Amino acid sequence: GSSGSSGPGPVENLQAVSTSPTSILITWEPPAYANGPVQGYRLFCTEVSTGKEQNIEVDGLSYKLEGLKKFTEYSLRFLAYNRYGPGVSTDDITVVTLSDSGPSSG
């Protein structure tokens, strides 16, 4: 069929951190040692708690995730994919969402 793909390299300046109870600011960049261009970037959000992974298709070099669990160890996975396909994937990004709790006076 279509035997012509090697897979691009792992993006650079990749980092994900939550700034709120349920969020995830993923900031990545275009790789240098990559095979050809980069059609885009694919993200995979997995809920260690349950174990469900949801594939997402974002664009650019910055995406703020929302609709997560207050405080739950989440594991994401970022990688680059071009005409050929998805290349080397990064290490499971573990980022425990913040915790909305402090001033509790009853």
Q: Which domains does the chain have, with CATH numbers?
A: 13-98 (2.60.40.10)
Q: Cα(89)–Cα(106) distance, rounded to whole angstroms?
A: 48
First-to-last C-alpha distance (Å) of the chain: 67
93 within 8 A of 75, measured Cβ to Cβ: yes
Way it was determined: NMR
Q: Cα(20)–Cα(84) distance, rounded to whole angstroms?
A: 37
Q: Cα(1)–Cα(104) distance, rounded to whole angstroms?
A: 63
Q: Cα(79)–Cα(66) distance, rounded to whole angstroms?
A: 20
Q: Residue 57, class by beta-carbon neighbours within 10 Å (0-12 exposed, 13-18 middle, 19+ buried)?
A: exposed
